[PDB]
Ligand binder design. Sequence first.
Ligand SMILES: CC(C)(COP(=O)(O)OP(=O)(O)OC[C@@H]1O[C@@H](n2cnc3c(N)ncnc32)[C@@H](O)[C@H]1OP(=O)(O)O)[C@H](O)C(=O)NCCC(=O)NCCSC(=O)CC(=O)O
Length: 440
Amino acid sequence: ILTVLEQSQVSPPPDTLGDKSLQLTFFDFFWLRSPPINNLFFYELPITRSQFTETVVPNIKHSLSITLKHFYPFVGKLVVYPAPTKKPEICYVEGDSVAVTFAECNLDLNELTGNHPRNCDKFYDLVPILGESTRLSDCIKIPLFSVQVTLFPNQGIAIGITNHHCLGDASTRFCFLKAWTSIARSGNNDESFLANGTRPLYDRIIKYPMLDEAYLKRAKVESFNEDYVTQSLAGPSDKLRATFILTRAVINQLKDRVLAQLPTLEYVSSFTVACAYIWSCIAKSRNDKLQLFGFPIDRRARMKPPIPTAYFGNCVGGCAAIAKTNLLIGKEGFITAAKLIGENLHKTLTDYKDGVLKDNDLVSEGMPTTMTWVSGTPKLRFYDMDFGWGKPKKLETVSIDHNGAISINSCKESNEDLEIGVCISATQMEDFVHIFDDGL
Ligand SMILES: CC(C)(COP(=O)(O)OP(=O)(O)OC[C@@H]1O[C@@H](n2cnc3c(N)ncnc32)[C@@H](O)[C@H]1OP(=O)(O)O)[C@H](O)C(=O)NCCC(=O)NCCSC(=O)CC(=O)O
């Protein structure tokens, strides 16, 4: 158990924000029908219930309230209209609030923050539901952001953050969390953020209305209202969650092996080599027929002209590779995976460089028996998010439980090591652990 201590609603301060809209782009419209993103930050601190109630609860409410006045779309809603013409948008109205749940969990915190296999479903009631939609005559309104702060008495605190992808990408979340934590750490005060921090850029500087309508047309907006359903993760399940570590020394040795065997491969990075290694492990674990492995790309810096990091919203692309499973197994399989990822990524980056804006081919060429998409951003350090109690002990992206996805992040006793999160059935996990460890 899970005991809910308070169900609150948090708004920007009185007499700050008026009614505000944010217009969206094809980059945002792409995510119209996506499931929620669920993220957890575990902190170790010997905190009592009385202390949690006396300072943590007020501090979370206050610091968040203040942050919201600078980050209005976080307290806004996604509004989708049934006329295929009128475009979805983010609307904040005075009176809008963020659902913030405060809870207490009696599980041992040490059993959750470890890297070894733990039940995936132990994490679900640490993350808030996105929240009920509001259905009006002219529209549906969907909440964008919710929070759960859970006390582990005498042990620590988990912060559970749920968001709709339409709100923005990992960079957007990073920018918001930077501000919120700065505001919290300095005593519920935004002066350090306003003086030294990075303010979000709401200028609509991505203007491709033809793509806008094509991605919207593809999102099937006229049926969205009738089709939309809540997508909360709930137990029970036999799936296990584990974190696998690639130390910098292992990564470097893997890079070297790729560069020696394939001296003219046009793209090799710590990232591609990490993906190739995990990809190879997944192939050996599955022993299936045909696999696709892919990952998102922050396109801000690759736009022509480049988009500021502080640009608010989505600016994400993608890259995928497909390969027969037998070609991906073993030491040579790792090499092949690196080749395929490196080649596909190089191609995608060149196509961006030369202007290209877009990107059932699977029915024709072959239906993959496994598909894996990477969540996570090793070069954005979510592991440095400090609300006043110190840096996180553990980060978990819970929403990888939903589909074919793994998470890849930095560690944060090291920005140069990689932590790889996997949630898979109990029977498959035993082999996977052996496959991962043995191959290193
Ligand atoms: C495609 C990427 C993953 C590629 O990562 P890389 O680490 O390779 O890229 P980078 O620019 O940081 O480059 C790091 C260094 O440059 C590389 N490098 C550059 N050019 C090269 C070339 N011609 N040959 C070989 N290597 C090259 C290496 O030197 C690498 O070394 P070194 O080994 O030293 O690094 C991308 O940089 C990116 O967009 N990452 C962010 C993705 C993101 O925003 N997340 C999703 C958003 S939200 C979402 O949808 C899901 C979610 O929540 O995550």
